[PDB]
Paper text:
Here, we report a general and rapid method for discovering α-helically constrained (Helicon) polypeptides that cooperatively induce the interaction between two target proteins without relying on previously known binders or an intrinsic affinity between the proteins. We show that Helicons are capable of binding every major class of E3 ubiquitin ligases, which are of great biological and therapeutic interest but remain largely intractable to targeting by small molecules. In addition to possessing increased stability and membrane permeability, Helicons are capable of binding large, flat protein surfaces that are inaccessible to targeting by small molecules, and Helicons have been developed to target a range of PPI targets in cells and in vivo. Characterizing Helicon-E3 co-structures and mechanisms of action, we identified new binding sites for α-helices on the E3 surfaces, as well as potential probes of the disease-linked E3, WWP123,24, highlighting the generality of our approach against this therapeutically important target class.
We performed screens of the naive phage library to identify Helicons that bind MDM2 and CHIP. Among the resulting hits, we validated CHIP-binding Helicons H317 and H318 from C80, including by x-ray crystallography to examine binding to their E3 presenters. Surprisingly, while Helicons H317 and H318 belong to the same cluster, we noted several differences in the co-structures with CHIP, reflecting unique conformational changes and binding surfaces revealed by the Helicons. For instance, the side chain of Glu9 in H317 directly interacts with Lys30 of CHIPTPR while Glu10 from H318 does not. As a proof of concept, we selected hit clusters for the RING/U-Box family E3s CHIP and MDM2, including those exemplified by H319 for MDM2 and H317 and H318 for CHIP, and designed focused libraries by fixing the conserved binding residues and diversifying the surface-exposed Helicon residues. Screens with the CHIP-based trimerizer library identified several CHIP-dependent PPIA clusters, including C86, C88, C89, and C94. Helicon H326 from C88 could promote ternary complex formation between CHIP and PPIA as shown by TR-FRET, and this was abolished by unlabeled CsA and diminished by the CHIP-binder H318 described in Fig. 3c, suggesting that the complex forms via the CsA-binding site of PPIA and the H318-binding site of CHIP. As expected, an unlabeled YAP1 fragment could also disrupt the interaction. Finally, we confirmed that while H321 and H322 do not interact with TEAD4 alone, they did show weak binding affinity to CHIP, at a higher EC50 than the CHIP-binder H318 characterized in Fig. 3c.
Residue numbers in the entry:
A (entry chain A): 21 to 152
B (entry chain B): 6 to 16
Amino acid sequence: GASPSAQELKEQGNRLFVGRKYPEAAACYGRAITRNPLVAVYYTNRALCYLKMQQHEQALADCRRALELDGQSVKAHFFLGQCQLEMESYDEAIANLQRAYSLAKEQRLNFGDDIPSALRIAKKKRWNSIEE
Amino acid sequence: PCYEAWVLCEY
Ligand SMILES: *CC(=O)Nc1ccc(NC(=O)C*)cc1
């Protein structure tokens, strides 16, 4: 048969992610890493698979691997913050979401209103957690 | 958020 490139396995994992085939997507991204472990986005994308599968420690670890390879990554900070939010690490989550916002502004990139919306939601959850 | 968009973006 054929052994794909790492880029081809990333694209395959992306397709699987869009179809809620989260373990299969994560395994694909793992095969991309086996081919080229120096590409941050494979880890970021796999981190979101792990978050969807409720494997929070694995998602955090992949975010950390991505940030060691690309400390400027908006997506890695955004996913890290979203993971931390689910784990109720509110202050860290908010700081990571805010860092994603600042990096997106510095890099002149558009992610929708996704980051300000995530921030609003995170702050709401944090405040409710304290008051209860 | 639009996680699918975030995942696929080549940025
Ligand atoms: C809602 C929506 O479409 N958001 C969104 C997220 C990400 C991106 N692009 C990248 O992440 C590179 C565009 C739009």
